[PDB]
Amino acid sequence: REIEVSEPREVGITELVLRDAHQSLMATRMAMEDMVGACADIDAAGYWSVECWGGATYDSCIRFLNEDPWERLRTFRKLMPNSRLQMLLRGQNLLGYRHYNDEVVDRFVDKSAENGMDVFRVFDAMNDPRNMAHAMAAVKKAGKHAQGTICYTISPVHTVEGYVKLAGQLLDMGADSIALKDIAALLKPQPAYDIIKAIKDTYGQKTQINLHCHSTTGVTEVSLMKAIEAGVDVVDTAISSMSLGPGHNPTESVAEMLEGTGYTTNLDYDRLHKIRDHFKAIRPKYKKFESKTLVDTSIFKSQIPGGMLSNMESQLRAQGAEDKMDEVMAEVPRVRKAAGFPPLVTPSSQIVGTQAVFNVMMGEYKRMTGEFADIMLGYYGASPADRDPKVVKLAEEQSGKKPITQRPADLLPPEWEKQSKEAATLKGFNGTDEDVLTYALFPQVAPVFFEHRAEGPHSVALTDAQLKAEA
Amino acid sequence: REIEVSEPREVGITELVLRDAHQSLMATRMAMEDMVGACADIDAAGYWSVECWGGATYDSCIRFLNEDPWERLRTFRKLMPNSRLQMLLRGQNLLGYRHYNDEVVDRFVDKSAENGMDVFRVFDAMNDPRNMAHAMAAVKKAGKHAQGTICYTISPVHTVEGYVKLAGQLLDMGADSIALKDIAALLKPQPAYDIIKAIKDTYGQKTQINLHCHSTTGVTEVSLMKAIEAGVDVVDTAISSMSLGPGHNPTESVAEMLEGTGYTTNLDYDRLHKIRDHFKAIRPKYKKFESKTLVDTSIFKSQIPGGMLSNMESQLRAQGAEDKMDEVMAEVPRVRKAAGFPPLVTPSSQIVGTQAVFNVMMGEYKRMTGEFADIMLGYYGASPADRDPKVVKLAEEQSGKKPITQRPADLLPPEWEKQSKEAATLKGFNGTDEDVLTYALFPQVAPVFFEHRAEGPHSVALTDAQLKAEA
Ligand SMILES: [Co+2]
Ligand SMILES: [Co+2]
User: Fold this and answer.
1) Which of A16, A104, B149, B464 could bond B123 through an S-S bridge, CB–CB 3.0 to 4.6 Å?
2) What is the Cα–Cα distance from B149 to B178, expressed in whole angstroms?
3) CA distance B265 to A271
């Protein structure tokens, strides 16, 4: 047999240690003083982009580190002046708990670019191209790199056709590149290869594509090799001393494997070696936050992310009937289908999970949560497939809400001023739109943070004194 | 571009959890009671072979577990009756500290087969086909599967040509299959592919080849994918809950990645799931023996295995001048070349290491160890390349020994009876050739073990009581 592979070329690499790595391995608890020491080396490493913001870091900065995310960004911008900063943004949900009016989005993106962010990976938990439409436009306006995301998953209705169709929409709404986000490491080799190849084949070699695979299942570094053969443009990795497990593949490993393949990743190996040693010395101080598993191929059978899994397990233990776990494992599939097969990521995974528990407890949809009902009624957006009209009807009947199918942000009122007004009454507020955004995104935290921020950022990691006095 | 790949087929898998996995991750300290519970499942998993003996397990059984290796084998043979048992045997060195007369070898192999071993992976630390010649013959005589090994490494004189030449010798001395042993995870993708393809191309598709890659560097699972494309016959893996790090790639991961590639590994996924959960519950009791690194691509620059590295680091600290480490790192290359570029594995790595320290300390070869001199004089066998005649001369001059170049076992006297005689005087001896072999292999331990063996095997792992009282 013959396998057509892409021509010899440089592959781009995106380092994730400053954001997704620690968010995935140590609950986003990584402190800023523990990171800044590797910025210079990271800046000189030779990465295509450096993901250092977005995701749960915004929340973890104000909720657990008494740190100002905007200060973290302004510092990274200053310490890595030659690098393309990158961040994760959940579209019309920004980094918040709900959707927001376009005003908010415009201001957020506006302030993010103004403070130095270069690449914005905009994504949506249900893959609704509409919820990414505005953010994408806000980034293009700001003259920044827009990156439309596709949340990869395995389901009866997800196919290469379906992902190419999605790639066309991301592009049509003016995406400067397409990012394939595989957070559960469900992206197998052949599929990774075909999907990448199909996109490039349909829209053209010029179509820029970035592959973001985690290594929870342990098969994605091979997918990264295939992806590169299909001709992918960039692949995300994490410095070896902060990889594997629910983390990602190792940068040095991924750069080393290419030797002699005709492909190459122009990265300074010595720079990388310094970065590795850096976090290798810091990582033990975060053991109270490490996950205890390195490989888990279970989701290939269950389709249930381990995180989601336990989140229900303990959810059942609280009712002692936590022995029906086996029944729940069988209910999820059925609940997901009812919801139109949405990727199982936050919040779809936690929503679908809980609802699956109620069903295995109080009968099939005899009771639904506010969220589940809102997902069935379409207040989060359109599902990859059609939702069980039966259940949709029931939702509207149980809650009392109106079933909608248009961008959930269309029927949202201007809320900026209102946010500004309320934020200008919290002790500690500084008057910037930044502090306003923090209140609009985290209304429950903004108060306590604004009052303590003057104390300076802290850390919840063990001190070198504690590592000692223990081991 | 086009890449020729092998036709669709089943790939064989060899589980290593019962031997190499725990030897690599927890210093061979795994206890037998902690393992037997997974034997039934492992037997029904569907593996090509199950490595459950050889390596340092023979030593660790008598030196730390007060267990009889032959009893361990007879039990595995009994608990996994449908499986092909496999073991690692360092040729004319068997599992001992020195070479032995052919008698010993014949008796050892004879007793190993008699007790149930089916596949013998015979290998040699310097790749001298002669030191494997007799063992290989002993296995064929015993009607068992002989597996000639090639220790893969990266050096100025190691090439695909060189490995094919070696493959021809292994075959010529009647090898039923060729095993490519990469213990430092130096086997990159393209090389793994070319080497496998070359062998198959030269000697034929029928030539059976088994790939044994560790994952210390983090690039070998990709090599395993390529190897399979080049048409490899079997690949070694370790149950996911006992993988990565200085360990190996995960069995479930490796079996899962093939989906849709036209290749497949007929393994019972549920059986595998039980095996995984088994060792996942047992593995924490061995934390006092776990390695603290998961990925390390340093040997690609240094060519110095991390194990060898630290083994010198601490070797220098004992002299306070442990700051010349940088000079040692530069000396090794030079010492290896002098020795003819031997793979850096036990004992070549520890020998070459020490000698490299003396050089960086007492001047270039101003003093040599007994071993280094014996390696230069050829008492371990022939090197992959020629040894610096300069240094060879110096060796013979420093020690006083005669320089030889023929199989070091040719000039060895019959020693069985002598061993039997001496072993029949140790309290606890049972009179079997087995107990005699133990004395011949471990003369320093056989005494203490024979006196305590009646106490039954023990464990040096934390007790479920200790895990608790700690965490
Ligand atoms: Co991620
Ligand atoms: Co091994």
Assistant:
1) B149
2) 6
3) 40
Span from the CA of A148 to the centroid of ligand 1 (angstroms): 14
d(CA B359, CA B437): 38
Q: How was this model experimentally determined?
A: X-ray
Nearest to A5 among B1, B217, B253 (CB): B1
Which residues, in sequence order, are CB contacts of B444 under 8 Å at separation 6+? none
Chain B from 219 to 238: CB within 8 A of any A CB: 219, 221-223, 225, 229
Residue A50 contacts residue A18 (beta carbons within 8 Å): yes
Those residues whose C-beta lies under 8 Å from the C-beta of residue A284, and which sit 6 or more positions away, are A462, A467
Residue appearing with tokens 């049972």: B430
Question: In terms of C-beta distances under 8 Å and separation of at least 24 residues, what long-range contacts does B389-396 make, across chains too?
Answer: B391/B338, B391/B365, B394/B365, B394/B368, B395/B368
- Using alpha carbons only, give the angle A166, A251, A467 rounded to the nearest 5 degrees: 120
B243 interfaces chain A, CB cutoff of 8 Å: yes
Of B244, B257, B301, the CB nearest to A222: B257
Contact B177, B233 (CB under 8 A): yes
- Nearest CA among B150, B114, B113 for reference residue B131: B150
Task: Please give the domain boundaries of chain A with CATH numbers for all domains.
Answer: 8-291 (3.20.20.70), 292-471 (no CATH)
Other C-beta atoms closer than 10 Å to the C-beta of A430 total: 13
Beta bridge partners of B10: B264
Which resolution, in Å, applies to this structure?
2.8
The bound ligand whose nearest atom lies closest to the alpha carbon of A19 is 1
Tell me the CA distances in angstroms from B285 to A366, B56, B459, B467, one per residue in order.
Answer: 45, 20, 10, 7
DSSP B123-136: --TT--THHHHHHH
> Which residues of chain B are within 8 Å of residue A248 when distances are taken between CB atoms?
none
Q: B217 alpha carbon to ligand 2 midpoint, in Å?
A: 14
How many residue pairs bridge chain A and chain B with CB atoms within 8 Å of each other?
Answer: 137
Q: Cα of A21 to ligand 1 centre, how many Å? A: 8
Of the candidates B299, B297, B249, B223, the one whose C-alpha atom is nearest the C-alpha of residue A252 is B297
The reply to whether A300 touches chain B by the CB within 8 Å rule is: yes
- In whole angstroms, give the CA distance from residue A427 to residue A412: 29
Beta strands, E only, B37-76:
49-54
Cβ(A251)–Cβ(A221) below 8 Å: no
Residues 6+ positions from A314 with CB-CB distance below 8 Å:
A322
A310 touches chain B (CB under 8 A): no
- Under 8 Å CB-to-CB from B291, ≥6 apart: which residues? B25, B245, B246
The end-to-end CA distance of chain A, in Å, is 55
Q: Please report which helix (H) or strand (E) contains residue A312, including its range.
A: helix A306-317
Which of A291, A198, A311, A201 has the alpha carbon at shortest distance from A247?
A: A291
Q: How far apart are the first and last CA of chain B?
A: 55
Residue B80, chain A, CB below 8 Å: the answer is no
Say how far apart CA A227 and CA A363 lie, in whole Å: 44
**How far is it, in rounded angstroms, from Cα B197 to Cα A402?**
63
Return the bridge partners of A12, or none.
Answer: A234
Listing DSSP states for A373-415 in one string gives: HHHHTTSS---SS---HHHHHHHHHHS-PPP--S-TTTT----
Residue B300 in contact with partner chain A when CB distance is under 8 A: yes
Among the bound ligands, name the one nearest to the CA of residue B213.
2
What gap in Å lies between CA B386 and CA A422, rounded to an integer?
81
